[PDB]
Every structure is written in C-alpha cells, then in structure tokens.
Amino acid sequence: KAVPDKFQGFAVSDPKNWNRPKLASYERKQINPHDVVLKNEVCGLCYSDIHTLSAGWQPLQRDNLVVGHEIIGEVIAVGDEVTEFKVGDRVGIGAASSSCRSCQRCDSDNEQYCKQGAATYNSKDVRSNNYVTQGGYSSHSIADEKFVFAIPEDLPSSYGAPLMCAGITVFSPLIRNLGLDARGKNVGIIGIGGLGHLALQFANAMGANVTAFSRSSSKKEQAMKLGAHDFVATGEDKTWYKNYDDHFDFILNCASGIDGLNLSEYLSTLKVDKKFVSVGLPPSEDKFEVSPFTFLQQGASFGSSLLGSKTEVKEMLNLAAKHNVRPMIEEVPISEENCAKALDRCHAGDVRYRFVFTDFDKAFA
Amino acid sequence: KAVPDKFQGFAVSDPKNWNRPKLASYERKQINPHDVVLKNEVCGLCYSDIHTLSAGWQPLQRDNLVVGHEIIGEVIAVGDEVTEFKVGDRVGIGAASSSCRSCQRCDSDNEQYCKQGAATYNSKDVRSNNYVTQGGYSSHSIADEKFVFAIPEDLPSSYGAPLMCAGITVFSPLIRNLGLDARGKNVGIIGIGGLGHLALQFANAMGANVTAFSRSSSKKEQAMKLGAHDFVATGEDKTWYKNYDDHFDFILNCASGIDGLNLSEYLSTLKVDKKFVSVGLPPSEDKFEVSPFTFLQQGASFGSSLLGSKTEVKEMLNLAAKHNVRPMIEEVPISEENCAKALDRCHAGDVRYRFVFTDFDKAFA
Ligand SMILES: NC(=O)C1=CN([C@@H]2O[C@H](COP(=O)(O)OP(=O)(O)OC[C@H]3O[C@@H](n4cnc5c(N)ncnc54)[C@H](OP(=O)(O)O)[C@@H]3O)[C@@H](O)[C@H]2O)C=CC1
Ligand SMILES: [Mg+2]
Ligand SMILES: [Zn+2]
Ligand SMILES: [Zn+2]
Ligand SMILES: [Zn+2]
C-alpha cells in the first residue's frame, strides 16, 4: 500500500527502438535497509539516456529498460537504517544509485567510484540479487541514501533536476582540478550541451577565465551570456589553437561524440603538466587519436571523470544558489509521444539546453 | 688558444650504420654569452641515442652526427654572461642543451619544455645560426648555462653521468606526482632497465612504497636490491591486479612498450584521480586511439614526461648524495670497437644497467 510491488516507466527492449519508449509495468527492486523510495516528480533527459537506449556503449542489460537519471521526487518510504531522509522530503537522485559501503572510496567522498557501484539504470545491483537497475522516466525510484541528495526549498524541481547529473558531473572535476576559487586560471569547455552549458556557468562562478568551444558559432551569444569570456567555433576558426599556446590550466570535454574534436589540437594549448578531462563519453566504437609527440610537447595528460560525490553535490548546490547557476530547460509532459519527440530532438541537437520531463501524475496515476 | 676550432667525436652519417660510429672532426658551435664549454670526461649511453642514430622516428639532421647526452666534463670556457660556472668546474649536461630564455616556461622551471628548445644532439639551434647540435661521444661539448649542472665532489664522474638523463627523466615525474617527501605513497615502476633501475632507487629514497613490474621474475632479486618493496611479474601472475585494488598513487612506465602493456590492468589499480605516466618512449608521430572509458572507473589520466628542470636536477643530486642513489654501470673506454659493442648490447637489453663511455683522453687528440 505505501509502496506498490510494481513501478511504471517508459521502457525500451530493443535498441532499434531507442527513440520509441513505451509505458510498461515492472517489478521494483527490493528496498534494502539503507534504501530510499521516491514518488517521482521530474526527470531530466541526459544524452547518456540516448547512448544507453541506442546500445552505443553496450547492449541493454535487461528487457523493458527504463532510463532517466536526473530525478527529483518526494520520499514515500525508507529502509530501517536510513538516517538522512524521512517520508515527505523532496530529494534528488543522479546517475549512481548505490555502492558497497565497505571500501575506502565509500568512506572518503569517492562513493561514485566504488568498484561495486551500481548505476541508476542498466546496471546489475549485486546488493539486490542482481536486479538490473531501473531509472527515472517512471513513477518511482529507489536509491541508497548515500546517492540521494537534499534539494534546497528555493530550487524548483524542474531546474533542480539537471543538477543531479549534468551539474555534479561538471562541478566535480572543476573543483577537484581548479579549487573552489578558480581566479587567474584559464578553463576551456568543449561541447555546449546539457553538461557544457552548466560547466560554463560553474567555471565562471568559480572565478575562472572561461573559453567556450563548439563546432559552430550558433551557440555563441547564449554561451557569452552563460559566463564564457571567450568563444571558439572550431569548425570555423580551423587554426584557432595557434593563438592559444601555453594558455589553459584545464580543459573539460563535455561533447557527446568525437565528430569535430581534434584532441591533439586541444592538448597543444595546455600549460605544462595540465589535464584534459573528458566527462563526455562517445559511443564505445568511437575514439580520439593523438601521437606520443604531442603528449611529449607539454607533459599534458588525457583522462576522464565520473559524476561526483554527495559532499560535492552539497557544495555545488550552495555555489549554484549563491551565483544563480541554473540549467536552461524545456519542460515536456512525460508520455510515449512526448518522450519520442524529446529523444529525437535531443539526438538532433535541437534543444537549449536540457529537456526535463514533468507532470508524472497524468502519466502514472 | 683555449677552445679548439674543431671537436672530435664518434659520428654517423647513415642510419644504416647506426651501430658503427666512426671517429670524425667537425666545426664547433659558436660560443654564446650564456654558453659553457666542456672538455668531456665521460658519457653514458642512453637508449634515445639508439632511437636517434637509427632514425626510426626522425631523420638525421646533419652529416657526422655525434650523439650521447649523459655528459660529465670539465669547464674550459664560458660566455661573458655566465655566472654560475668557472673554468675548472666539474659539470654535466643532459638531453636538452638550450632554450629561448624569453617564455614563461623558461621563466618557471619548465625550460626543458621550451617550444624553441634545442636537444643536446641532432637539433637545429635557432640561437646559433641553425647549427645542428652535437653530443657527448666527443672531445668537447657546449651548452647553455641553464642546461649545465654542477656535479658535487662526492659523485664520481662515471656514476654521475647517467643521472644527467636517465636520472632526471625518472626523478622529475616522481617529484611532480608524488612530492619530494613521498612517505606513505604507493608507486608502481614498470620496466627495470636503464631508467627503471634508477626509478626504483629514487622512489625508495623519497620514502615511497615501491612495486616493481616486469614481464617475468628475472629482474626480481635485482629490483628488490634497488629499492623495490614488492614485485609483479605480469606475464606470470596474469591476474595480479586483483591484489592491488585502490593501491597506487602513481604509476611510472619506464620505457616499456605501451602496445605490450595492458594499460587497463595498471589503471584498475590506481587510487582515484591519479596518473599513469610514460617516459623514455620514442617521440613517434603515429596517432593511436584513446578512449575515456579506459580511465572512467578510476578518474585516471594518462600522459608523458620529458626530462626535467635544473631545479629538479639540484634536488635529485642532493637526494642521491644523502641516500646513496647510484646507477649500476658498465664502464667502457670509448673507441670505435667499444662504441659498436655497447650500441649492439644496449639495443639488446644486455646491460646491467647503463653503459658509461670513459677514457676520453686516449681516444681524442
Ligand atoms: N562522465 C559522466 O559521469 C557523465 C557523462 N555524460 C556524457 O556527457 C556527454 C554529454 O551529455 P549531454 O550534455 O547530456 O549531451 P548534449 O547532447 O546535451 O550535449 C552534447 C554536446 O556535444 C556536441 N556534440 C553533439 N554531437 C556531437 C558529435 N557527434 N561529436 C562531437 N560533439 C558533439 C554539441 O555541442 P556543440 O553544439 O557546442 O558542438 C552538443 O551540445 C554524453 O556523452 C554523456 O553520455 C553525461 C553525464 C555524466
Ligand atoms: Mg662574465
Ligand atoms: Zn552516465
Ligand atoms: Zn565501496
Ligand atoms: Zn623558452
């Protein structure tokens, strides 16, 4: 009665039908002693959802897979061991949903890097009898309390939602590599989508000197408004990197692909011993290419970063409220039709800058 | 009259004869205000000498090329603006010999990364009328003051010479990534050869917990003698990484072939947000693919390091003195025959662990 045995969600079984999710009922994950159960209110559309649904990284790990991992909802139940939340709290869930609670990472604000971590969707939870996790395009969500985040009362759910993944995912590497105060440091942000448009704002808020990089200049005016001090359209200014020798303290890639992205040219603009970090994750088949030479010129490193920690989520929300960092969203009532539309438009790149699904009651009640 | 108009060296003009250098005379570089002129005493045999002589990655940039860049010698002359060295001083030269003196990198302990820098051999020196630089298999050497290092009296020349390249090449990434006091830190050193044998000793001297890696156990007893605290034979213990979860603060690849490395195994043993760095690899311009997924689970990074700074060299030498860090060398009177024998063996891996050419007074007029 409090929690139904089955949840409802918009689901896909075949990657050929990645853009045609359909209403499905499915057995819920067990509620473990540290678990929190939400009645979902909103969910953002992350390009990770599309990569997952299209099997561009790996095959779908279950039938009727429900994606979505920028979730805001209300607590309707908690396990007996939950200490951090109570029924009626409005909270958020991002891209990871549980960890082992018994490793050093779990106890030192690296729980998103737990070796036995379970993603919010498409992932086997070994703590829940190998339940393959179900996401947030759904009436309800379950996550371990370490992966459920308090939402400030003044942040409306729709704007709060993309911060649960896009936000924390770009905030984590910026604070880790630049410090909270990034004054004097130059930061490049590649790929001005969901993640990138938030990275511009967060980097600007930290005091950094921000260069926005995009394949074209169509997003220039908005990027400038979002906190970029500098804009480069790499498809138009083909030799841009020649003016940026020894310039960047850090480069953060937020692009969904490898299409217009010459990694060597980016590395050539880093200062000595600085990092290029890709939070962007193209399909598994697609890679960047780059010679030992250009690594050698700079002592530059290439790497990636995954999500962020709960400590970091709290810091990020504080900073966001402080400097008015908010995602630019387009709200869409959840439905088979609207999810199809929104997935297709997101794939087409037609969005400024994040779709957020809303009005869950009309769908699931 | 102080400096001879011509120097003598064992030189090659055809990469087909990479391993059979012949005595030859050549006009010296002009002596610039910050230049230092050495009468050479010893020169270590570095593997990059074989890379260069064989032209495997870059063609010979002059006729009668003289390689060798692990030089110890005695100052016979200085340009009018030198202040740090006086005639009679016993000094050393590594793999870079000059830099622009007018960029941030030169200004800030990164002169080895100067964009207009000149290698100790086979490099056009834009400051010296495009003279193609000549190395230390020779009677004399000329280098810029910032690339000439004072040798402490307690360091014999033959033992000091490999510190000028191998030593700094491995010490720089250690100090840059572990800090100079690396107590409590775990470091992995891959490839126990010319470079790795010094890397073990430096890492141990800095206070680190050192794991030595090689394909077989053949170098294990030696690695243990050189400062390794434990050893992994990756061809014998194929699942070794299972016992090193979340272990390493840094991993340094000491010229082990990246193709022959299973990078993913090493990366899976790093702590969060750490680096796998490679040194001593040929500066090939051939591309190779990189994927963010390779690094994602650890927030890891991959990159390179090139030589090191004079500041770092000074620290390295003090450390070597305090802790008795010293290469294991096989001394070889310089001659055509001995150069051939040593080049052949060094190419083979058949040296324990560095050849040092000696007795220059008998070879040279
Ligand atoms: N590391 C992590 O933990 C997380 C990673 N991600 C990943 O981050 C990436 C971005 O996600 P999100 O911001 O939602 O995606 P969006 O589609 O919202 O934005 C992606 C941006 O990439 C650029 N782009 C689009 N197609 C290509 C292509 N073929 N090649 C290169 N660039 C392209 C566009 O920027 P422009 O028009 O400026 O060129 C676009 O705005 C995805 O790969 C996603 O899987 C997401 C969440 C977390
Ligand atoms: Mg003077
Ligand atoms: Zn993801
Ligand atoms: Zn854990
Ligand atoms: Zn310079």
XYZ file of N, CA and C in Angstrom, chain A residues 7 44 98 115 143 148 206 213 237 249 256 285 291 345:
42
model
N 6.476 -0.775 -10.342
C 6.512 0.619 -10.777
C 6.108 0.675 -12.242
N 15.207 14.774 -15.871
C 15.888 15.421 -16.978
C 16.288 14.392 -18.019
N 23.825 3.229 -5.848
C 24.325 2.518 -4.681
C 25.811 2.151 -4.789
N 34.023 0.323 -6.620
C 34.242 -0.731 -7.601
C 32.973 -1.562 -7.797
N 16.945 4.408 -4.335
C 18.411 4.538 -4.281
C 18.898 4.460 -2.856
N 21.208 9.916 -2.582
C 20.008 10.722 -2.581
C 20.427 12.057 -1.969
N 33.206 30.220 -10.334
C 34.404 29.955 -9.539
C 35.485 31.029 -9.740
N 34.125 26.223 -26.296
C 34.456 25.607 -27.582
C 33.256 24.858 -28.128
N 37.020 28.543 -37.172
C 38.376 29.040 -36.957
C 39.302 27.830 -36.911
N 44.864 26.032 -18.108
C 45.190 25.326 -16.877
C 44.405 24.016 -16.808
N 29.195 15.050 -26.749
C 28.602 13.721 -26.783
C 29.318 12.757 -27.742
N 32.634 2.567 -29.822
C 33.366 2.353 -31.070
C 34.222 3.568 -31.415
N 49.220 11.477 -31.019
C 50.559 10.865 -31.018
C 51.370 11.093 -29.734
N 14.606 15.061 -30.808
C 15.132 16.424 -30.847
C 16.480 16.527 -30.158
